[PDB]
Design a protein around this ligand. Sequence first.
Ligand SMILES: N[C@@H](CCCC[NH3+])C(=O)O
Ligand SMILES: N[C@@H](CCCC[NH3+])C(=O)O
Lengths: 296, 296
Amino acid sequence: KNIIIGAMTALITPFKNGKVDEQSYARLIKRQIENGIDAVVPVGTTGESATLTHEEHRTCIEIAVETCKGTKVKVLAGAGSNATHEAVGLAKFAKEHGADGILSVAPFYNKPTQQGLYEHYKAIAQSVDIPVLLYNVPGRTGCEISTDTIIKLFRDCENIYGVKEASGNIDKCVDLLAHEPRMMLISGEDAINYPILSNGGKGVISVTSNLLPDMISALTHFALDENYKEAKKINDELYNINKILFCESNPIPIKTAMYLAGLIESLEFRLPLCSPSKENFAKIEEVMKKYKIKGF
Amino acid sequence: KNIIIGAMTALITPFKNGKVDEQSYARLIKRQIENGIDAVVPVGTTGESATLTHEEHRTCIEIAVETCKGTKVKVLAGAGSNATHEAVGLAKFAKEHGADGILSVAPFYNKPTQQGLYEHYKAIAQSVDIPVLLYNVPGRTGCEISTDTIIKLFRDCENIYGVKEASGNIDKCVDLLAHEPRMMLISGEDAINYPILSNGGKGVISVTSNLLPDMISALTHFALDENYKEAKKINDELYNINKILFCESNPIPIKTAMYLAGLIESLEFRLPLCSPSKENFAKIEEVMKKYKIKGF
Ligand SMILES: N[C@@H](CCCC[NH3+])C(=O)O
Ligand SMILES: N[C@@H](CCCC[NH3+])C(=O)O
């Protein structure tokens, strides 16, 4: 199976005057590349998938592919949708435009059954020939991809190679890899990056890495080499910032931190996302003071 | 405040060969009109908003408007989105094409803060001059519109007149009407229609009414006329069908029931939605036989 693993970043999508800031997007990706990141994920939850048009979604995938050209960094393109025909379209676009693989979030809002999730992902996987990583985040979607469904998809579809888990459920991570040790379990939850990796997870798709790519990168590669002492020390050091980046709904805190660090020009979200409370703004600024934030 | 209340139906969207069956849609609406229903809700969750294109979404609203033309039945158009620019577009279309009001589900998947929900709905309400009914269903969206946010929106925006609650939380329904008794609280949870109405709720937006419109309309009108003994008797009789219509995720069971009753031509969904299990299919069929289903 071909895979996309290692330290990976869920890219924020910067806006300027309501539009996608395209030179800022490329500069941010370059910064990720230069700080040891193995793959970038354009337009997932952290990239405000919901409020981008299908056109802008495709533009961000193109900038990501073009920027990683001539490097080892891969593009795991965000391509999920709660409509199977929409998810297949994004997957086909990502393949035709040079993505190395796709991330595909479980359908949100309409809550398909396990049978429906299976058929949803099989249709996506059969539409292209690049790796497909499932993405389970039940707190945001309202549905869960069960362990049985994940394992069935991995065994039944050649290009489905694993899952990004954002479920706060280390029991499920044991279940997954105890019954199907060939799959690539990816941490979707920065605070518990090390425990997932120490159980045989093979990478992370990180929010914190937007701000501290070098630290998340070192953590992941220490862990992959079974240097657990070093990996845990970094995971422990990162806990405070990992938690404060979800004081409000992601990506409101991470965009706030990137702006405070001078890495993006203006805060700016697209509604219904908005700027944090003054309290949380001050809390994010405080926690940031304890870390070294690389510039450009 | 101008309002839309009473017994209302979250319309299923029938498909034939994968496209919207517009003649079946109009025929089902007429069936609703003839059984005492006060308003219809095109393209909600029950109408598979997620998998309709923006254009089919608009077509369904138009059919509802024509079919209710010249009748006392109102059209409360499904116009929600997790992207504020999308929700404003749908709201303006509904207004421009003759809907009496709009339903607007809380943004799903991207989990805005309470401040974001306020700005989201303030933008929608300021875009049109027809009534706007908020819609809270946290099990599907991943977010909750707090009682404070609902009340602030009701008091601050002229056209925002109430909320459809599908949260299984009668405590919140007391909270809402104890602090703001002027709003229109609408039941979005069939099994507890009567308790919500008996606390001063003023209508239902029902899934069960697709199959038994006469019973749901009677229940609502009994309750509004303060005949709580008869409203409760119907709510109690309907409990079994009200629960079995959610044995799987709505609208998989209700479409299964409509097909079993001979009210739609084919049991077709759009992926990721699919047919129920064989077991569930048999369970829906067995419960249906205890009720009298109106024909055409
Ligand atoms: N509001 C839509 C936008 C999809 C198009 C861009 N990803 C959704 O969240 O599904
Ligand atoms: N699947 C997307 C697009 C729906 C557009 C038509 N209602 C969503 O749920 O937001």
